[PDB]
Scaffold this active site. Structure first.
Site, PDB file in Angstrom:
ATOM      1  N   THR A 141      47.812  28.996  40.392  1.00  0.00           N
ATOM      2  CA  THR A 141      48.890  29.541  39.520  1.00  0.00           C
ATOM      3  C   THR A 141      48.507  30.884  38.935  1.00  0.00           C
ATOM      4  O   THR A 141      47.379  31.088  38.491  1.00  0.00           O
ATOM      5  CB  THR A 141      49.225  28.593  38.343  1.00  0.00           C
ATOM      6  OG1 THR A 141      49.482  27.274  38.840  1.00  0.00           O
ATOM      7  CG2 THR A 141      50.452  29.096  37.566  1.00  0.00           C
ATOM      8  N   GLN A 142      49.468  31.798  38.951  1.00  0.00           N
ATOM      9  CA  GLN A 142      49.465  32.957  38.075  1.00  0.00           C
ATOM     10  C   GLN A 142      50.831  33.008  37.424  1.00  0.00           C
ATOM     11  O   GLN A 142      51.848  32.958  38.122  1.00  0.00           O
ATOM     12  CB  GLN A 142      49.188  34.271  38.812  1.00  0.00           C
ATOM     13  CG  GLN A 142      47.786  34.410  39.356  1.00  0.00           C
ATOM     14  CD  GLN A 142      47.482  35.827  39.793  1.00  0.00           C
ATOM     15  OE1 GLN A 142      48.340  36.707  39.719  1.00  0.00           O
ATOM     16  NE2 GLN A 142      46.255  36.058  40.249  1.00  0.00           N
ATOM     17  N   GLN A 143      50.858  33.073  36.107  1.00  0.00           N
ATOM     18  CA  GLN A 143      52.109  33.330  35.438  1.00  0.00           C
ATOM     19  C   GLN A 143      52.112  34.755  34.901  1.00  0.00           C
ATOM     20  O   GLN A 143      51.069  35.270  34.484  1.00  0.00           O
ATOM     21  CB  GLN A 143      52.334  32.362  34.279  1.00  0.00           C
ATOM     22  CG  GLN A 143      52.064  30.934  34.624  1.00  0.00           C
ATOM     23  CD  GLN A 143      51.755  30.150  33.385  1.00  0.00           C
ATOM     24  OE1 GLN A 143      50.791  29.384  33.335  1.00  0.00           O
ATOM     25  NE2 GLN A 143      52.571  30.351  32.358  1.00  0.00           N
ATOM     26  N   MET A 165      47.981  29.591  47.380  1.00  0.00           N
ATOM     27  CA  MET A 165      48.747  29.248  46.185  1.00  0.00           C
ATOM     28  C   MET A 165      48.160  29.943  44.955  1.00  0.00           C
ATOM     29  O   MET A 165      47.802  29.320  43.953  1.00  0.00           O
ATOM     30  CB  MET A 165      48.818  27.732  45.994  1.00  0.00           C
ATOM     31  CG  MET A 165      49.739  27.045  46.996  1.00  0.00           C
ATOM     32  SD  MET A 165      49.921  25.280  46.700  1.00  0.00           S
ATOM     33  CE  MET A 165      50.579  24.710  48.273  1.00  0.00           C
ATOM     34  N   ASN A 166      48.077  31.270  45.058  1.00  0.00           N
ATOM     35  CA  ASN A 166      47.496  32.117  44.027  1.00  0.00           C
ATOM     36  C   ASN A 166      48.075  33.523  44.133  1.00  0.00           C
ATOM     37  O   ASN A 166      47.361  34.470  44.493  1.00  0.00           O
ATOM     38  CB  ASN A 166      45.980  32.163  44.172  1.00  0.00           C
ATOM     39  CG  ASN A 166      45.305  32.696  42.940  1.00  0.00           C
ATOM     40  OD1 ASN A 166      44.794  33.817  42.932  1.00  0.00           O
ATOM     41  ND2 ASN A 166      45.312  31.896  41.874  1.00  0.00           N
TER      42      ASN A 166
END
Lengths: 232, 116
Positions: free
Chosen positions: A1-3, A107-108
């Site tokens: 995840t990156q938000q 997924m990054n």
């Protein structure tokens, strides 16, 4: 995840007969707070390419590093490397396309939309778009983020299809962009009064104008609107 | 007997009890006059204060229903206040549910229907 944390808003663009125009404002927003006034989001790479990057700022700056190194890489070896084998735009774009796809497969994601605007050594217009998924498409006119729903219907009027490109000159296009910024400053929360704008011509090279300001704002009607309905 | 107390018709064909109400009106000895101006309306009525003891200010026959509507009453004053209080409520409720001020006609037509 990156938000996303800090972000910038739209990048808007269009071809015309001699080159391409690309514009984007200078605002880093951290939620409601408009935290950073003046965060330049167009980075010229060489002198016949601009790469406009929106979305997260932490990662805007991390793609600025890869793009500064790519220039340094090519410079190695024979001076023919920067005379006539110099970096086309269509290269620089393919390096960011291959980077974005790989990141999303861990997924990054690098959390950015990107527009590469340039003119090739062949003479041709090149204008393409990539984003955190890796979707790619080329059009007469391109917009990112919020300007895909708003700015683009306005610029698509000018140049609708492929045959309008050799008719639209630089006087018409420069106006059409500056008029788009005007509508984004009315109707977007994260935009600012200060934007930057780049004209890539195939006869005078790169012209990079900083801190052009929206002017001619109509509020003249606003003093008549009164009440929220039933109020007298 | 029980055709003249309540409101049913008499054998003749007349609502006696209603008819008896009009004779109840002229039981205060107030006279009033009301004329249409060119852009205004004026209504005068006599104001008799019987005893020295009464405070002359409270005795009144002119009731402010709204900014738009005034109302002058002829008759016994308990029923005055009862019809004025119901008028005020309808004047407010109209404004709330339709969003403009109640016209004169519409306040008049709402009272005739409660009266019926």
């Amino acid at each position: 995840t990156q938000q996303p944390i800090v972000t910038g808003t739209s990048v808007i663009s269009m071809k015309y007969d001699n080159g391409v125009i690309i514009a984007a404002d200078n605002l880093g927003s951290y939620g409601s707070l408009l935290r950073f006034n003046g965060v330049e989001r167009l980075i010229p790479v060489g002198d016949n390419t601009v790469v406009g990057i929106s979305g997260d700022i932490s990662d805007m700056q991390h793609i600025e590093r890869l793009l500064k190194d790519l220039v340094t890489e090519n410079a190695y070896d024979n001076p023919l490397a920067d005379a006539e084998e110099a970096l086309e735009p269509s290269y620089i774009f393919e390096y960011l396309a291959t980077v974005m796809y790989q990141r999303r497969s861990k997924m990054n994601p690098l959390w950015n939309a990107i527009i590469v605007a340039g003119v090739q050594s062949n003479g041709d217009q090149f204008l393409r778009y990539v984003n955190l998924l890796g979707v790619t498409y080329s059009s007469p006119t391109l917009a990112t983020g919020f300007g895909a729903h708003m700015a683009n219907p306005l610029l698509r009027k000018v140049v609708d299809r492929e045959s309008d490109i050799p008719k639209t000159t630089v006087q018409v296009a420069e106006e059409a962009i500056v008029n788009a910024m005007r509508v984004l400053y009315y109707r977007d929360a994260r935009s600012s009064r200060n934007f930057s704008l780049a004209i890539i011509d195939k006869n005078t090279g790169l012209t990079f104008k900083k801190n052009l300001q929206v002017e001619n704002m109509k509020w003249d009607f606003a003093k008549d609107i009164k009440g929220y309905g039933t109020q007298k | 007997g029980y055709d003249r107390h309540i409101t049913i018709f008499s054998p003749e064909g007349r609502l006696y009890q209603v008819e008896y109400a009009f004779k109840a009106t002229n039981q205060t000895n107030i006279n009033s006059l009301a004329v249409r101006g060119k852009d205004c309306t004026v209504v005068i009525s006599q104001k008799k204060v019987p005893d020295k003891l009464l405070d002359p200010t409270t005795v009144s026959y002119i009731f402010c229903i709204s900014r738009t509507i005034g109302m002058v009453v002829n008759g016994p004053i308990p029923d005055a206040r009862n019809a004025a209080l119901r008028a005020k409520a309808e004047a407010a409720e109209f404004r709330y549910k339709y969003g403009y001020d109640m016209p004169c006609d519409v306040l008049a037509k709402r009272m005739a229907n409660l009266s019926q």
